[PDB]
Ligand binder design. Structure first.
Ligand SMILES: *[C@@H]1O[C@H](CO)[C@@H](O[C@@H]2O[C@H](CO)[C@@H](O)[C@H](O)[C@H]2NC(C)=O)[C@H](O)[C@H]1NC(C)=O
Ligand SMILES: CC(C)CCC[C@@H](C)[C@H]1CC[C@H]2[C@@H]3CC=C4C[C@@H](O)CC[C@]4(C)[C@H]3CC[C@]12C
Ligand SMILES: CC(C)CCC[C@@H](C)[C@H]1CC[C@H]2[C@@H]3CC=C4C[C@@H](O)CC[C@]4(C)[C@H]3CC[C@]12C
Ligand SMILES: CC(C)CCC[C@@H](C)[C@H]1CC[C@H]2[C@@H]3CC=C4C[C@@H](O)CC[C@]4(C)[C@H]3CC[C@]12C
Ligand SMILES: CC(C)CCC[C@@H](C)[C@H]1CC[C@H]2[C@@H]3CC=C4C[C@@H](O)CC[C@]4(C)[C@H]3CC[C@]12C
Ligand SMILES: CC(C)CCC[C@@H](C)[C@H]1CC[C@H]2[C@@H]3CC=C4C[C@@H](O)CC[C@]4(C)[C@H]3CC[C@]12C
Ligand SMILES: *[C@@H]1O[C@H](CO)[C@@H](O)[C@H](O)[C@H]1NC(C)=O
Ligand SMILES: *[C@@H]1O[C@H](CO)[C@@H](O)[C@H](O)[C@H]1NC(C)=O
Ligand SMILES: *[C@@H]1O[C@H](CO)[C@@H](O)[C@H](O)[C@H]1NC(C)=O
Lengths: 219, 403, 214, 451
């Protein structure tokens, strides 16, 4: 069984920086009767099925942009993007185009460097339909920040509540290369109406002081 | 009996029925027929140096010694018991098994012309020939040799008929496969056909004076048989493929079917009686030499039982190379005796004086024949070697229980 | 065009067999070999087997005993039989398409998120989010559903700006995700923006027309 | 007293041993009779359409051909299918006589010396008889009924001069094709029943090939049936199996086309994979010249693709000196044991020698997708198993022998005679349940009777 080892586990570049990712096979992937190297390169955008880019280690598939150049032979291979775009954020794999059991690659995630940007904090009260069933949950969204490491801390009218809060970052955007973060608090019907003011705080690298959005129950 | 009629007594013994089995075995280990032809002509003049020095030896051990083994060996080596024991259990009965087995393959080959013959059905018909010919010797020694001289004509006209067709129809050096393990193992099979030259003194010495006759009567009778053995190979190499006669149990029947339809009827009844009498004559000489309390009759039953034990083998060319390793062992221990008697005894030697040139060509040659096949495959030599030492239990039984 | 439709994700109890379909269009099924590829989320790809016009399989040794690939030549779809589903079988099962003995999977499938568990299917409970009191955001909180894939878009292809659908998180053996959309405040009073959900394990399509807070 | 029983027990025991020997040869199965092998069944054929290009540059006479036969018999061909050498000026009916040879080729006394020198090497010359071999329409578009009698009168003249068969091509271009092949097969067999008549057709579909073989069952029919096999040999298992059942496993020629080479239809990676298949299928392979060295109608500028120039050495093409390399020649491939000329000399050795490949039976069983495999067997001789991998990947052959007869069933190991790709050791035994072929590799495994 051929073993495929993709060298860089995760890389981050800016737009137009000529990224390369390496590969290495255990057994030799060069049939020495036709001298054609056998390796493939797939591209998996986040949330989508994979897509073939390169077969026989240098032949680009039909409909692939010309930034993707692959070269090498023997037991070393390299996929090269000449200049990355904003939408080339994906995960790149490696197959074995000449084998009985086709062993795939490990995987390599391509991030994108951009300049820093501050979030856009918005806080929502629970809706009228959720208030009917007997449950209460408040939501604090955080839109369009780059560096993807925000520690959101919840405060209830001067009391920092940090037990049982949910967080879920989204994958990096393909248009403006930014992230997003949601933050929902799980409370009861009795725990929500026992207080009035709710504070969501957003720590970032853009500002020293946190960005605060809030609301009051009574109005 | 003169020089002319005395030579015809010699060729009656040396043209045996072994000629009909060996050319498949000489081609299997020499490949192309051009190399297979020179192996045939090599062993013929290889025999003429060995059969002539035995003729210098056998005339002296019959007059001064007076027996085959003992009185010669009390000069040579006083343990002669294992020499008679190796002669009588693996030399005589295995020779009587092969000549019986070629009768079995040729009798069934018209029934299975393209199939191989069922080899467990060839073990039965071979032993059905021996049990018929064991009892015919024990019942009447008179009636046994009478049809045997009639069967001596059957091996000649069937052999001449093959050469008769070898002239009617009329690469060679391509597939040599030269190997020292192969050129000595294909030389064993060609030497199996030259049988009986080591028993040649009892046949021709009694008739006329052996002064200059017996070298001159053997120096012309061996080139006259080596021509006939080569002329029966060209009758195979022209009438058949080298690939057809490599996969063949009876090569003469495959030859005979190619030419005439009722010539297929006439071959296995002619060569069938060739080896029928050849195993009959081989029971005669093996009966008396153990004798020369016990009658000649239990000597016939001992070489009968111990030749049925060779039905546990697998092929003919396995036991032929098992035979030739030990047949050529014991002749080297004989001719080492006469050169040791070149400084020991005067022997009153006026049959023939010359011992300089001829035996030294031979003893180094059969030692080369015994060297390669021992290192090659001793799984047949070792099972023959595990039993030659087993006579020493019987030797201890003879030292003290008779004392 | 080359289209490989697929069944969508399915929920099953453990040690029950699963048959997944890979219905195709746009090419003759008998002239190309259709392969199957397993991928657990956040991990590497794994290959399962092949098929042909003579229903001849070439399986992989790690997954040969519990997979039985079959092809229905009439309706132009291939099948994949699961056997004895253990808890490490929750994955996506892609069904690709390769040329006649070349092993270069060009046109892939759409993906089926097989999820195996002993639990029960639960329909989602969707609640909107209104801002109340230069652009403003609308939210759609979808809470309480067990089978994980839910596709949330806004007004079925109308709104494509600021559509941030967050990944699903797991708590109390249910999944809760929320979506967001960024639009100016001139459009949403002058229109109405309605969150729509799709739950392909149950086909529970619920819409919530967003009312504004006072 | 004591003499009574012990001879009577031998009188019992000898018949106690004869009672086994007399029934064992009756319980044992016997051979069935060999079929009468005609001379063309015993090996391959070899077509020379152009004598001018087989040796080259004005030395293409029939008299110069005699030096080539010791090369041409090292390939171990059993026939020779010399092109149309009769005098014919193109598209002209009255000025074509099939009795006299064109003096550009030689003369009548040169041809009769060629037949005599071919008999010493066991090579049979099969004369072509396509009447208009220079026009695009081969069979004289109008007045078709006298050119039928022009060949019928010339079927007697070359048969009394010592040719050993005949060959006509393009029988799709004359009317009444199935009836004219019936009169000529009678004349060619009524003279002697060891003569040949190879017809040739360009039609690739099966239903036009069976209509020619339903009247005459004793001619070879070369055609382009196997020509459009696919891009990578896709329908090769389908086309080989369906044709042998369409005729009920009769005798039939196996060739890619009626006149063209191998490389006019295949990539260069599939040449060693088809020369293994064309020798071991139950019929006479009909190669054209240059198919033993991998001659290419392309890759050399200024070449007529109907008749390329043979590459004997590097001096074969003096028109462009830097084109012909040292591995594309007959001399350059003779000593190289991994070349293509050695494969043609190892496979035609086995086709002429062994009896399973000669007139054995054919039983192809199921395997993995993308590879073809079949068995070859006579009564009790050596058995042959060919495995061809037509895919561009390293498939593991899963051999499912569930429909083979009990006389010819698979062993657990079988030793490798030769493989078309270097990388395996030859002669060693090879397991069958774990085979694991290479991309575009073919194997030839043998195993004995053992039943
Ligand atoms: C095989 O031979 C037939 C002979 O009839 C060819 O058919 C002719 O093709 C020419 C030009 O291609 C046409 O002008 C004729 O009208 C055709 N005749 C008929 C009866 O169809 C056919 O093209 C050949 N096939 C190949 C691949 O060469
Ligand atoms: C020692 C002596 C008595 C041995 C005699 C052997 C006899 C019985 C054997 C040897 C040759 C044999 C024949 C060889 C060939 C054929 C042709 C076949 O189609 C029918 C059997 C037949 C006709 C055989 C009959 C039996 C046969 C005559
Ligand atoms: C114990 C001693 C005295 C026995 C003497 C007789 C022996 C040597 C003989 C008599 C009968 C013979 C057997 C007769 C037939 C067959 C069948 C054949 O397919 C293999 C050999 C075999 C099995 C023989 C072996 C040797 C045998 C057993
Ligand atoms: C000298 C003695 C021991 C030889 C004995 C040979 C015996 C066993 C052989 C020789 C001739 C043989 C017969 C020759 C022909 C036939 C006809 C065939 O359709 C059935 C077998 C049968 C009937 C054979 C049986 C076996 C047979 C009788
Ligand atoms: C194979 C096994 C069973 C051994 C067979 C041994 C046979 C061949 C031997 C053993 C005993 C022998 C017998 C012993 C004594 C006599 C008396 C004599 O006046 C005629 C021969 C005769 C009748 C012998 C015939 C051959 C014989 C039967
Ligand atoms: C002395 C007594 C006990 C036995 C006399 C017969 C002996 C010498 C015979 C009978 C059985 C014979 C064996 C039968 C079969 C085989 C297998 C073969 O691959 C090598 C030779 C070998 C091993 C033979 C050697 C010689 C042998 C042992
Ligand atoms: C040839 O034809 C004639 C009459 O047409 C016929 O009698 C004869 O048998 C044929 N020859 C064969 C079939 O060999
Ligand atoms: C061969 O002949 C028939 C007729 O076409 C075919 O359908 C079938 O596959 C084969 N039958 C047998 C018995 O081999
Ligand atoms: C012959 O050798 C040349 C090197 O000069 C090489 O380019 C060519 O591919 C070789 N021919 C074949 C058929 O491989």
């Amino acid at each position: 069984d051929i073993v495929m080892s993709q060298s860089p586990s995760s890389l981050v570049v800016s737009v137009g920086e000529k990224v390369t990712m390496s590969c290495x096979x255990x057994x030799x992937x060069x049939x020495x009767x036709x001298x054609x190297x056998x390796x493939x390169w797939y591209q998996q955008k986040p949330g989508q099925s994979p897509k073939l880019l390169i077969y026989x280690x240098x032949x680009x598939x039909x409909g692939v942009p010309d930034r993707f150049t692959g070269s090498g032979s023997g037991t070393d291979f390299t996929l090269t993007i000449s200049s990355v775009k904003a939408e080339d954020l994906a995960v790149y794999y490696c197959x074995x185009x000449x084998x009985x059991x086709x062993x795939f690659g490990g995987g390599t995630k391509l991030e994108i460097k951009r300049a820093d940007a501050a979030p856009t904090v918005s806080i929502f009260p629970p809706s009228s339909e959720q208030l009917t069933s007997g449950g209460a949950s408040v939501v604090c969204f955080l839109n369009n920040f780059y560096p993807k490491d925000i520690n959101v801390k919840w405060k209830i009218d001067g009391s920092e509540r940090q037990n049982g809060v949910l967080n879920s970052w989204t994958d990096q955007d393909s248009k403006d290369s930014t992230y997003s973060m949601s933050s929902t608090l799980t409370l009861t019907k009795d725990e929500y109406e026992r207080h009035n003011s709710y504070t969501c705080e957003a720590t970032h690298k853009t500002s020293t002081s946190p960005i605060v959005k809030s609301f009051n129950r009574n109005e | 009996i003169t020089l002319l009629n005395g030579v015809a007594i010699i060729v009656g013994t040396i043209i045996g029925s072994g000629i009909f089995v060996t050319p498949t075995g000489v081609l299997k280990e020499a490949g192309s027929p051009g190399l297979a032809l020179v192996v045939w002509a090599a062993c013929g003049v290889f025999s003429i140096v060995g059969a002539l020095c035995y003729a210098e030896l056998g005339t002296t051990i019959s007059k001064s010694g007076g027996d085959y083994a003992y009185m010669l060996e009390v000069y040579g080596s006083l343990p002669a018991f294992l020499k008679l024991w190796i002669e009588l259990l693996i030399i005589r009965p295995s020779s009587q098994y092969i000549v019986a087995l070629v009768f079995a393959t040729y009798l069934l080959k018209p029934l299975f012309p393209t199939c191989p013959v069922p080899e467990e059905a060839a073990k039965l018909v071979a032993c059905l020939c021996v049990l018929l010919l064991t009892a015919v010797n024990c019942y009447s020694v008179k009636a046994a040799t009478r049809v045997q001289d009639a069967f001596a004509a059957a091996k000649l006209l069937a052999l001449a008929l093959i050469i008769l067709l070898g002239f009617v129809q009329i690469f060679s050096f391509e597939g040599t496969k030269l190997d020292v393990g192969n050129i000595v193992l294909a030389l064993y099979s060609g030497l199996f056909a030259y049988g009986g030259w080591n028993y040649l003194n009892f046949v021709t010495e009694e008739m006329i004076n052996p002064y200059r006759n017996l070298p001159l009567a053997i120096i012309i009778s061996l080139p006259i048989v080596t021509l006939v053995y080569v002329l029966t190979n060209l009758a195979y190499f022209t009438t058949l493929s080298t690939e057809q006669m490599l996969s063949s149990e009876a090569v003469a029947v495959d030859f005979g079917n190619y030419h005439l339809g009722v010539m297929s009827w006439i071959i296995p009844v002619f060569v069938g009686l060739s080896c029928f009498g050849s195993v009959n004559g081989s029971l005669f000489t093996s009966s008396r030499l153990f004798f020369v309390l016990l009658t000649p009759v239990p000597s016939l039953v001992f070489t009968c039982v111990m030749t049925l034990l060779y039905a546990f083998s697998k092929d003919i060319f396995s036991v032929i190379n098992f035979f030739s390793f030990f047949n050529w062992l014991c002749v080297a221990l004989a001719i080492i005796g006469m050169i040791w008697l070149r400084h020991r005894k005067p022997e009153l030697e006026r049959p023939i004086k010359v011992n300089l040139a001829l035996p030294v060509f031979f003893i180094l040659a059969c030692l080369f024949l015994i060297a390669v096949s021992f290192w090659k495959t001793p799984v047949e030599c070792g099972i023959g070697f595990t039993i030659i030492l087993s006579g020493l239990p019987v030797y201890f039984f003879g030292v003290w229980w008779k004392n | 065009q080359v289209q490989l439709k697929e069944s969508g994700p399915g929920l099953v109890a453990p040690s029950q067999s699963l048959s997944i379909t890979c219905t195709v269009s746009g090419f003759p099924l008998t002239x190309x070999x259709x392969x199957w590829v397993r991928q657990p989320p956040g991990k590497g790809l794994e290959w399962l087997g092949x098929x042909x016009x003579x229903x001849x399989x070439x399986x992989x040794x790690x997954x040969x005993x519990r997979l039985s690939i079959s092809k229905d030549n009439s309706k132009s779809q291939v099948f994949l039989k699961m056997n004895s589903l253990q808890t490490d079988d929750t994955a996506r099962y892609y069904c690709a398409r390769x040329x006649x003995x070349x092993x270069x999977x060009x046109x892939w499938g759409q993906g089926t998120s097989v999820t195996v568990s002993s639990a029960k299917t639960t329909p989602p409970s969707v609640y909107p989010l209104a801002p109340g009191s230069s652009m403003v955001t609308l939210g759609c909180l979808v809470k309480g559903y067990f089978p994980e894939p839910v596709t949330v878009t806004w007004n079925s292809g109308s709104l494509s700006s600021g559509v941030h659908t967050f990944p699903a998180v797991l708590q109390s053996d249910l999944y809760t995700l929320s979506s967001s959309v960024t639009v100016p405040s001139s459009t949403w009073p002058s229109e109405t923006v309605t969150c729509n959900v799709a739950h392909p394990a149950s086909s529970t399509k619920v819409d919530k027309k967003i009312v504004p807070r006072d | 007293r004591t003499r009574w029983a012990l001879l009577l027990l031998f009188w019992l025991g000898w018949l106690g041993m004869l009672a086994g020997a007399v029934v064992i040869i009756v319980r044992a199965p016997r051979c069935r009779e060999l079929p009468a092998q005609k001379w063309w069944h015993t090996g391959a054929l070899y077509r020379i359409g152009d004598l001018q290009a087989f040796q080259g540059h004005g030395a293409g006479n029939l008299a110069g051909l005699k030096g080539r036969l010791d090369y041409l018999s090292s390939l171990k061909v059993k026939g020779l299918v010399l092109g149309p050498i009769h005098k014919n000026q193109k598209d002209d009916v009255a000025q074509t006589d099939l009795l006299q040879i064109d003096p550009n080729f030689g003369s009548k006394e040169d041809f009769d010396s060629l037949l005599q020198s071919a008999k010493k090497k066991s090579i049979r010359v099969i004369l072509d008889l396509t009447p208009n071999y220079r026009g695009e329409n081969s069979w004289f578009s109008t007045q078709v009924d006298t050119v039928a009698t022009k060949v019928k009168d010339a079927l007697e003249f070359w048969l009394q001069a010592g040719v050993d068969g005949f060959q006509v091509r393009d029988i799709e271009n004359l009317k009444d094709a199935s009836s004219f092949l019936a009169e000529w097969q009678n004349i060619t067999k009524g003279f002697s029943e060891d003569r040949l008549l190879i017809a040739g057709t360009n039609s690739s579909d099966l239903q036009q090939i069976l209509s020619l073989l339903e009247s005459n069952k004793d001619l070879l029919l070369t055609s382009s049936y196997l020509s459009d096999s696919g891009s990578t040999g896709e329908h090769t298992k389908s086309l080989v199996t369906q044709y042998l059942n369409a005729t009920g496993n009769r005798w039939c020629s196996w060739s890619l086309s009626q006149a063209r080479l191998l490389t006019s239809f295949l990539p260069a990676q599939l040449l060693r994979l088809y020369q293994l298949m064309l020798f071991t299928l139950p019929g006479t392979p009909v190669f054209s010249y240059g198919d033993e060295i991998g001659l290419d109608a392309a890759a050399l500028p200024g070449q007529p693709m109907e008749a390329p120039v043979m590459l004997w050495d590097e001096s074969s093409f003096p028109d462009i000196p830097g084109a012909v390399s040292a591995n594309m020649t007959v001399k350059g491939q003779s000593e190289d044991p991994g070349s293509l000329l050695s494969l043609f000399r190892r496979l035609s050795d086995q086709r002429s020698k062994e009896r399973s490949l000669l007139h054995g039976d054919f039983h192809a069983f199921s395997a993995g997708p993308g590879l073809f495999s079949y068995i070859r067997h006579w009564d009790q001789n050596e058995r042959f198993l060919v495995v061809l991998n037509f895919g561009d990947v390293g498939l593991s052959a899963g051999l499912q022998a569930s429909d083979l007869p009990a006389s010819a069933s698979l062993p657990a190991k079988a030793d490798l005679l030769l493989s078309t790709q270097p990388g395996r050791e030859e002669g060693s035994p090879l397991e069958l349940e774990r085979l694991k072929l290479e991309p575009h590799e073919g194997l030839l495994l043998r195993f004995p009777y053992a039943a």
